[PDB]
Amino acid sequence: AWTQVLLPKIKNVVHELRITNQV
Amino acid sequence: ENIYNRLGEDLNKWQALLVQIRKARGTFDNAETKKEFGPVVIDYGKVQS
């Protein structure tokens, strides 16, 4: 059930794109 | 031109202020948009870009 949920409570993972010293 | 004349032929040409400028990138160029302090919030929103 967890696997098909990936594809059962799942935490939402989030990550960002930023820029620094122009990179 | 004033800077170039003032620091004519430094360590090589400047080599010094080009180091402290990167530190002067502080208070700046960060994900933070407004500096808080106590109940006074100073927001540098219009200038950040």
PDB file of all heavy atoms in Angstrom, chain A residues 18 20-21, chain B residues 22 25 31:
ATOM      1  N   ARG A  18      17.490  27.376  -5.474  1.00  0.00           N
ATOM      2  CA  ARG A  18      17.861  28.778  -5.341  1.00  0.00           C
ATOM      3  C   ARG A  18      19.135  29.083  -6.111  1.00  0.00           C
ATOM      4  O   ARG A  18      19.634  28.249  -6.874  1.00  0.00           O
ATOM      5  CB  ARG A  18      18.051  29.203  -3.882  1.00  0.00           C
ATOM      6  CG  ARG A  18      19.313  28.678  -3.222  1.00  0.00           C
ATOM      7  CD  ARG A  18      19.456  29.215  -1.803  1.00  0.00           C
ATOM      8  NE  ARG A  18      18.475  28.711  -0.854  1.00  0.00           N
ATOM      9  CZ  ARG A  18      18.342  29.175   0.380  1.00  0.00           C
ATOM     10  NH1 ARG A  18      19.100  30.160   0.832  1.00  0.00           N
ATOM     11  NH2 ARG A  18      17.420  28.644   1.178  1.00  0.00           N
ATOM     12  N   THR A  20      22.991  31.447  -5.631  1.00  0.00           N
ATOM     13  CA  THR A  20      23.863  32.239  -4.772  1.00  0.00           C
ATOM     14  C   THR A  20      25.240  32.360  -5.405  1.00  0.00           C
ATOM     15  O   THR A  20      25.712  31.427  -6.059  1.00  0.00           O
ATOM     16  CB  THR A  20      23.972  31.638  -3.368  1.00  0.00           C
ATOM     17  OG1 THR A  20      24.827  32.460  -2.560  1.00  0.00           O
ATOM     18  CG2 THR A  20      24.524  30.221  -3.428  1.00  0.00           C
ATOM     19  N   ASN A  21      25.868  33.524  -5.201  1.00  0.00           N
ATOM     20  CA  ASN A  21      27.020  33.995  -5.969  1.00  0.00           C
ATOM     21  C   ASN A  21      26.833  33.679  -7.449  1.00  0.00           C
ATOM     22  O   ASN A  21      27.791  33.352  -8.156  1.00  0.00           O
ATOM     23  CB  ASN A  21      28.339  33.435  -5.418  1.00  0.00           C
ATOM     24  CG  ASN A  21      28.414  31.927  -5.446  1.00  0.00           C
ATOM     25  OD1 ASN A  21      28.371  31.305  -6.503  1.00  0.00           O
ATOM     26  ND2 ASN A  21      28.524  31.325  -4.268  1.00  0.00           N
TER      27      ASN A  21
ATOM     28  N   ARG B  22      33.393  40.714  -1.425  1.00  0.00           N
ATOM     29  CA  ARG B  22      32.646  39.475  -1.247  1.00  0.00           C
ATOM     30  C   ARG B  22      32.025  39.403   0.143  1.00  0.00           C
ATOM     31  O   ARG B  22      30.895  38.929   0.302  1.00  0.00           O
ATOM     32  CB  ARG B  22      33.551  38.271  -1.505  1.00  0.00           C
ATOM     33  CG  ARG B  22      32.888  36.925  -1.261  1.00  0.00           C
ATOM     34  CD  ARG B  22      33.707  35.797  -1.863  1.00  0.00           C
ATOM     35  NE  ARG B  22      33.256  35.442  -3.203  1.00  0.00           N
ATOM     36  CZ  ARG B  22      32.259  34.608  -3.456  1.00  0.00           C
ATOM     37  NH1 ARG B  22      31.591  34.014  -2.480  1.00  0.00           N
ATOM     38  NH2 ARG B  22      31.927  34.355  -4.718  1.00  0.00           N
ATOM     39  N   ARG B  25      29.032  41.484   0.342  1.00  0.00           N
ATOM     40  CA  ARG B  25      27.830  40.850  -0.186  1.00  0.00           C
ATOM     41  C   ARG B  25      26.891  40.491   0.959  1.00  0.00           C
ATOM     42  O   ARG B  25      25.744  40.101   0.728  1.00  0.00           O
ATOM     43  CB  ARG B  25      28.167  39.599  -1.001  1.00  0.00           C
ATOM     44  CG  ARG B  25      28.239  39.812  -2.505  1.00  0.00           C
ATOM     45  CD  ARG B  25      28.642  38.528  -3.214  1.00  0.00           C
ATOM     46  NE  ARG B  25      27.748  37.414  -2.916  1.00  0.00           N
ATOM     47  CZ  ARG B  25      28.046  36.136  -3.123  1.00  0.00           C
ATOM     48  NH1 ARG B  25      29.230  35.770  -3.586  1.00  0.00           N
ATOM     49  NH2 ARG B  25      27.139  35.202  -2.850  1.00  0.00           N
ATOM     50  N   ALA B  31      18.412  34.582   1.119  1.00  0.00           N
ATOM     51  CA  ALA B  31      16.997  34.239   1.060  1.00  0.00           C
ATOM     52  C   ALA B  31      16.152  35.142   1.946  1.00  0.00           C
ATOM     53  O   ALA B  31      14.969  35.348   1.655  1.00  0.00           O
ATOM     54  CB  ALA B  31      16.790  32.777   1.455  1.00  0.00           C
TER      55      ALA B  31
END
